[PDB]
Amino acid sequence: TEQEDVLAKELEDVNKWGLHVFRIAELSGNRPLTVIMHTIFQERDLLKTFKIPVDTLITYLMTLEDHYHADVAYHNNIHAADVVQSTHVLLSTPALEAVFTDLEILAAIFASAIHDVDHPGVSNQFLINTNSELALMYNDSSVLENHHLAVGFKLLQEENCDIFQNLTKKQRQSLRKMVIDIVLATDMSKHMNLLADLKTMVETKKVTSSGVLLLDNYSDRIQVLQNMVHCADLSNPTKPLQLYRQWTDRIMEEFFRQGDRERERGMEISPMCDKHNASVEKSQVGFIDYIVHPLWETWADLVHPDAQDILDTLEDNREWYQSTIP
Numbered sequence: 001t002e003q004e005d006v007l008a009k010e011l012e013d014v015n016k017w018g019l020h021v022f023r024i025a026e027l028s029g030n031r032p033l034t035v036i037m038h039t040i041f042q043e044r045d046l047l048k049t050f051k052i053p054v055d056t057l058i059t060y061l062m063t064l065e066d067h068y069h070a071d072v073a074y075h076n077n078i079h080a081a082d083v084v085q086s087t088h089v090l091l092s093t094p095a096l097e098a099v100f101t102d103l104e105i106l107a108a109i110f111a112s113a114i115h116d117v118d119h120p121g122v123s124n125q126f127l128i129n130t131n132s133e134l135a136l137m138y139n140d141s142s143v144l145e146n147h148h149l150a151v152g153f154k155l156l157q158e159e160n161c162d163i164f165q166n167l168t169k170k171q172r173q174s175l176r177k178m179v180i181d182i183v184l185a186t187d188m189s190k191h192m193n194l195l196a197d198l199k200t201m202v203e204t205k206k207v208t209s210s211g212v213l214l215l216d217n218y219s220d221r222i223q224v225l226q227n228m229v230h231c232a233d234l235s236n237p238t239k240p241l242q243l244y245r246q247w248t249d250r251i252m253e254e255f256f257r258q259g260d261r262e263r264e265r266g267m268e269i270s271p272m273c274d275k276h277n278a279s280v281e282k283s284q285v286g287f288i289d290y291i292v293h294p295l296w297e298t299w300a301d302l303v304h305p306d307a308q309d310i311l312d313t314l315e316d317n318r319e320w321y322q323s324t325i326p
């Protein structure tokens with residue numbers, strides 16, 4: 001009850017950017033995804049809205065969480081929980097108030113939860129270069145992201161795991177399509193085109209009487225949800241520094257382990273994966289400058305000024321990492 005009391009206290013921050021997700025992972029007995037998803041579903045009244053039995057939700061979440069690899073440093077259940085919670089916060093931004101339906105909200109949150117499930121800790125390119133079964137199955141195209149979807153949906157069919165059992169056929173059809181569109185958009189090979197389209201939307205942005213974003217067709221609606229989850233996936237450098245540094249520690253461990261496998265095969269070691277020749281700090285500054293800040297600056301423009309503090313933190317963290325180089 002004492003550890004449970006402390007966990008409940010920490011979960012009171014579920015609506016805040018910079019939640020202590022690593023603390024929650026420890027306090028929950030390595031069940032951050034289950035406890036954070038359960039909390040968010042309760043917070044958003046999703047169990048009642050979609051008639052989800054609580055035991056079914058918990059059973060699915062525990063099984064989903066189990067299919068993240070405990071021995072992968074970055075792409076594990078803590079990352080999934082973090083992306084879920086970040087998406088949850090982004091969904092609540094004033095500029096999107098009443099924009100999305102309950103089904104669309106469910107899609108975005110569910111997509112976030114499953115988006116990296118059964119990740120092996122190596123990149124799509126590694127899987128392609130090594131002639132893996134995954135790459136063979138998926139014809140070198142969004143190899144991991146296709147797999148995450150297949151696993152996430154497949155687990156719904158396990159005993160007492162169908163959390164969507166009380167949705168209508170049309171609701172299930174719509175949800176499935178939206179979730180596929182969102183998770184496939186987390187493939188970094190799609191980033192530049194996704195960002196280009198987001199910029200176009202910002203340039204042509206329209207708002208309602210209430211000052212809320214106007215999205216009146218599927219293409220625009222799904223595009224915003226795709227970029228939202230993608231922003232959440234790329235949110236580490238926008239978090240308070242003590243969180244960001246832990247994420248960087250973890251991704252570098254994962255990258256180095258891949259580089260060790262490439263070194264042992266006689267392959268050229270991938271960028272940033274050589275533990276004997278890797279500038280962690282320069283790499284983060286480049287990551288922010290070329291990928292994360294261009295994305296987040298554009299998201300911030302879409303919802304201006306809702307995300308100014310997130311953007312300010314990103315810029316501060318970029319400055320901090322840069323300062324360690326000279």
Ligand SMILES: CC(C)CC(=O)c1ccc(OC(F)F)c(O[C@H]2CCOC2)c1
Nearest residue numbers: 233234236237247248251272283284287
């Ligand atoms: C974006 C993709 C979906 C996951 C990814 O590759 C990823 C996520 C977070 C990273 O850093 C930090 F925020 F934790 C990261 O750093 C690499 C790249 C630059 O130097 C090392 C890579």
Ligand SMILES: [Mg+2]
Nearest residue numbers: 066068069070
């Ligand atoms: Mg596992």
Ligand SMILES: [Mg+2]
Nearest residue numbers: 115116144186
């Ligand atoms: Mg991924």
Ligand SMILES: [Zn+2]
Nearest residue numbers: 083115116233
């Ligand atoms: Zn991810």
